[PDB]
Design a protein around this ligand. Structure first.
Ligand SMILES: [Zn+2]
Length: 257
C-alpha cells in the first residue's frame, strides 16, 4: 500500500487515488511575491485553552496526537473561515536531513518539518462527513526550523520511544498544543487537499508565516521512529512529505502586508 518509498511513494499515489492529479491538491509552493494581501481576511481565532489530548499513535506514516472532538473544546475560527472547526489531531512531516521535510515551501525553501493541526467543520457533524465537503476541514500548518529547542515540544519527543513502530499507541493526556504555536498568527491561505491518501479536496489551508524553532536533538528523535511494525525490518520514518503540487487555478492570499 501507499507510503514514501521508491516503489510506493507520492509519484505512485495517482494509480490508487486518481484525485492526486486533481485541481486543488496540496501542498503547494507559496510564492511570497505573488500572494496578495487581502484586507478582508480576519485574524485567526485559535481557542485551545480547553483542549483535551488523549493519545499518541504511530500510524505507519506519521504519529498523530489525538484530541477529544466530542464537544467544542479546542476550536479554530475566524481567518478565512465561516463557522467553527474542532481540533481532532495534529501530526508532523519531516526529513532525513534538516534541508527538507516540509510539505509546503516558501519561495521554494523547504523547512526541516511541518506541523499540521487538523480541524473539522462542526456543521457536518463528524470528521468522516466533513472530509466529503469542500469546506470540511481547516488545517493550520506551521513550519519548523532547526535552532533553539521548543520547550513545548519536548513532552512529544520524549514519548516517541514508546510508539516506535506502526500500530503502537500510548496515553497522551494533558498536552497543551498552545505550546507549539509561534508568536505571530500572520498567515497565507488557499483551498486544497489532504496531503496523504485519500487526497480529498476538502481543506482550507492556513499556513503560518512565522516558523517555530526546534533543536537538532528534537528532530533527531523524530527520525528514530519506524514506518514498519514491530519485529519487521527497520525502516526509519523519515521523508514522510509530499512534494509541492501544481497551483492550477488558485490564488494564495496573505493576511498581512
Ligand atoms: Zn499532514
Amino acid at each position: 500500500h501507499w507510503g514514501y518509498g521508491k516503489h510506493n511513494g507520492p509519484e505512485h499515489w495517482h494509480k490508487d487515488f486518481p484525485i492526486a492529479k486533481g485541481e486543488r491538491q496540496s501542498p503547494v509552493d507559496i510564492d511570497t511575491h505573488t500572494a496578495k494581501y487581502d484586507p478582508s481576511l480576519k485574524p485567526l481565532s485559535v481557542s485551545y485553552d480547553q483542549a483535551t489530548s488523549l493519545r499518541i499513535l504511530n500510524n505507519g506514516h506519521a504519529f498523530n496526537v489525538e484530541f477529544d472532538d466530542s464537544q467544542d473544546k479546542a476550536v479554530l475560527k475566524g481567518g478565512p473561515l465561516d463557522g467553527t472547526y474542532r481540533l481532532i489531531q495534529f501530526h508532523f512531516h519531516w526529513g532525513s536531513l534538516d534541508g527538507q521535510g516540509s510539505e509546503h515551501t516558501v519561495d521554494k525553501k523547504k523547512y526541516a518539518a511541518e506541523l499540521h493541526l487538523v480541524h473539522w467543520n462542526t456543521k457536518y457533524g463528524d470528521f468522516g462527513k466533513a472530509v466529503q465537503q469542500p469546506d470540511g476541514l481547516a488545517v493550520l500548518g506551521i513550519f519548523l526550523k532547526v535552532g533553539s529547542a521548543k520547550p513545548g515540544l519536548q513532552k512529544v519527543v520524549d514519548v516517541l520511544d514508546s510508539i516506535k513502530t506502526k500500530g503502537k499507541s500510548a496515553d497522551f493526556t494533558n498536552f497543551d498544543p498552545r505550546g507549539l504555536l509561534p508568536e505571530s498568527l500572520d498567515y497565507w491561505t488557499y483551498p486544497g487537499s489532504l496531503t496523504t491518501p485519500p487526497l480529498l479536496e476538502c481543506v482550507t489551508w492556513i499556513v503560518l508565516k512565522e516558523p517555530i524553532s526546534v533543536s537538532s536533538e528534537q528532530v533527531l528523535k523524530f527520525r528514530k521512529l519506524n514506518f514498519n511494525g514491530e519485529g519487521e525490518p527497520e525502516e526509519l520514518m523519515v521523508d514522510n512529505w509530499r512534494p509541492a503540487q501544481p497551483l492550477k487555478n488558485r490564488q494564495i492570499k496573505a493576511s498581512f502586508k
